[PDB]
Design a protein around this ligand. Structure first.
Ligand code: FMN
Ligand code: CA
Ligand code: CA
Ligand code: ZN
Ligand code: ZN
Lengths: 174, 174
């Protein structure tokens, strides 16, 4: 019964986030949602209070217990580099790197491929990424497609193109 | 300009909800989210917790303050009928009737058209509705279409067909 660690940044795009969670719940895939935050209480881009399962600090060292990582992008991302030293963002890099190195399935949209890329795990792999974050892809092969599936990477250009890969994401977890 | 009252049942389908909220937010359309519940704190079908703006009881008497109602469906709706002693479900019927009677734009998906139908406001209008809820449509005219726009009614069969009518909804609310 497959298990996914869903990473929700703060603020998270709720439309992206619930596309994933709704598809997992409807298809009987297990998930736990970790805030990329000090607290499990976060906000959506649109300002709604959202309380998820746990915080990313508590995912570290437990990466083994999951089959897949979802990076659910949001308005936190454009300020990531500015706040790279925040503990939740140091944990973010380590966890993405660990999942990547352990061969887990890596799922993301908008700037998710960029977060993956920063850790080097995307080396030589086709990724779809927000057209704005395309210049920051240094290790992966950034394309202009709505989504790219390559090896362990499942990435969509943004929330409005998650649909183009989601049936395949679900099938790979079922 | 235009103001939308969004009704979130408990549990709500978060994929449906945020498709609306992201679209409104990104197009600068004003909205306020009301829990169809005894408190502002609701769950998603997927088990996340949302704290919304207010409860539906506080929308009673203020329907003319809004231009549009969104009914955001969830796994609460198929138990709606069992739960006649929840005051917020009685309030729901009241609020939907009042909005429809006052000629407001009525927007919803999945079993939303059925909630509308129960109040009678759908008399003679085409609606899109989830297949399982279709036989419950007696006042309106249920179709097999992905979405239906008829008069003041903008309804989608479910969360995965919202995209088919959402640009028209946005255009109408500008
Ligand atoms: C035929 C086709 C199918 C689509 N299916 C979905 C869908 O299931 N869910 C969704 O959010 N968007 C879907 N889109 C809508 C796109 O998000 C939209 O056209 C752009 O924003 C679809 C678009 C086309 C090309
Ligand atoms: Ca949002
Ligand atoms: Ca949900
Ligand atoms: Zn993003
Ligand atoms: Zn429903």
């Amino acid at each position: 019964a497959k298990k996914v660690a869903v990473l929700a940044v703060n603020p998270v795009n709720g439309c992206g986030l619930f596309q994933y969670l709704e598809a997992f719940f409807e298809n009987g895939i297990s998930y736990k949602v970790f805030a990329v935050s000090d607290t499990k209480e976060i906000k959506t881009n649109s300002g709604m209070v959202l309380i998820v399962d746990d915080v990313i600090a508590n995912l570290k060292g437990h990466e083994d217990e999951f089959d897949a990582l979802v990076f659910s992008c949001g308005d936190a991302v454009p300020v990531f580099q500015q706040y790279a030293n925040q503990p939740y963002n140091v944990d973010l890099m380590e966890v993405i790197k660990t999942f990547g190195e352990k061969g887990k399935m890596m799922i993301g949209h908008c700037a998710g491929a960029m977060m993956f890329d920063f850790t080097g795990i995307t080396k030589g792999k086709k990724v779809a990424v927000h057209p704005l974050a395309k210049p920051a892809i240094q290790n992966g092969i950034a394309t202009d497609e709505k989504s790219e599936i390559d090896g362990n990477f499942f990435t969509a250009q943004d929330e409005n193109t998650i649909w183009t890969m989601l049936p395949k994401v679900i099938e790979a977890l079922k």
